């Protein structure tokens, strides 16, 4: 429900989506051929069922990067230059754009507020889920730690939005009352100490969701600047060395593709793995792995 939708907000290029669709149709042809994938450079040998799962995650990811290439309005970086397919009022050629993402006076505050808002939803869902699991097993310290982090975090967020954000310091101060009262009540009815230094890192974990907009703007204007340099210095310098600039911008664009899509593919899943999974526990006593009677077949 979350990770491909975040990766869409990372990668908003329709050309990246088309190249992913090409490698996905290649890889689904590879599971049609029923060959185990082998490469001795990485010593990667693996069975086609994992490769079919990779087909499934790649399709369910590439839909969201298509739709966030539409809303962010970027075709292969920026090929709206010749055909003005995306409508900004500085050069309105065709259908409008929802958010421009290349400038920051129009984009950055809204996108940064939504990027914090997803972390708000995620972390409050995680702490509510830890409180649920503490309510289940009749173990009370988990319930108190969950309600304490929830109250302290919403109190710090309300105090931040009031005394460092806008005006109207009247309504939210009762929410600050409630939040810090619940936090002190939890620490008193808990005796589960060293939660007090954790709430600063807890606000760190609700606030560290900036990185989706950060790598989104980074990769987006990096691709846009590369195709800008290539397209401009090819077209308006010579008019027939345009294939020279086009293919060198293409090969450098595929170079930065191959050199940082690993990193800004890894960023949403580490965001999940080190905020959401570690809020509700998940790191205690390792469970026990179910292995049946094999009959290896």
């Amino acid at each position: 429900v979350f990770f491909p939708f975040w990766f869409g907000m990372i990668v908003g290029d329709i050309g990246y989506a088309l190249l992913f669709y090409l490698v996905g149709r290649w890889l689904s042809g590879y599971v049609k051929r029923n060959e185990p994938l082998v490469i001795d450079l990485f010593a990667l040998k693996l069975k086609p069922q994992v490769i079919g799962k990779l087909v499934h995650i790649l399709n369910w990811m590439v839909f969201w990067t298509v739709v966030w290439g539409v809303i962010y309005g970027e075709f292969f970086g920026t090929f709206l230059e010749h055909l003005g397919v995306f409508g900004t009022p500085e050069h309105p050629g065709l259908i409008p754009i929802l958010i421009h993402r290349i400038d920051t006076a129009k984009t950055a505050n809204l996108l940064i507020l939504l990027s914090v808002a997803f972390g708000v939803v995620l972390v409050f869902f995680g702490l509510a889920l830890r409180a649920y699991l503490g309510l289940k097993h009749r173990h009370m310290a988990h319930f108190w730690e969950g309600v304490g982090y929830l109250g302290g975090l919403v109190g710090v967020l309300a105090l931040a939005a009031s005394y460092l954000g806008n005006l109207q310091a009247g309504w939210l101060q009762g929410l600050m009352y409630l939040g810090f009262g619940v936090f002190l009540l939890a620490v008193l009815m808990s005796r589960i100490w060293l939660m007090i230094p954790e709430i600063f890192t807890q606000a760190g974990h609700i606030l560290s969701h900036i990185r989706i907009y950060a790598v989104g703007a980074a990769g987006g204007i990096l691709a846009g600047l590369l195709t800008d340099v290539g397209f401009a210095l090819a077209e308006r310098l010579g008019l027939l060395g345009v294939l020279l600039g086009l293919l060198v911008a293409g090969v450098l664009h595929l170079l930065i593709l191959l050199l940082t899509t690993l990193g800004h593919m890894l960023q949403p899943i580490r965001l999940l793995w080190v905020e959401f999974f570690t809020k509700f526990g998940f790191y205690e006593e390792n469970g026990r792995p179910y292995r049946p009677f094999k009959s290896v077949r």
Binding site: V274, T278, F282, Y283
Partner: protein
Amino acid sequence: GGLDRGLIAVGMGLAVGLAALGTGVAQARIGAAGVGAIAEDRSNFGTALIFLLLPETLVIFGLLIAFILNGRL
């Protein structure tokens, strides 16, 4: 604009870069010991990740001061 707008921006960017240097210094040694403990066996993953990504509060604090200075102008 004048000297005001110019100097608040370098007071922003120095804070961001230098807090990033701090958490790089931390995550260097913590990632070294983490890659070690994983390379022993694939069992310390849930503790290597939390001990590795405990120091990112520094750079979110740097971004907090940066956004305060951005809204300040």
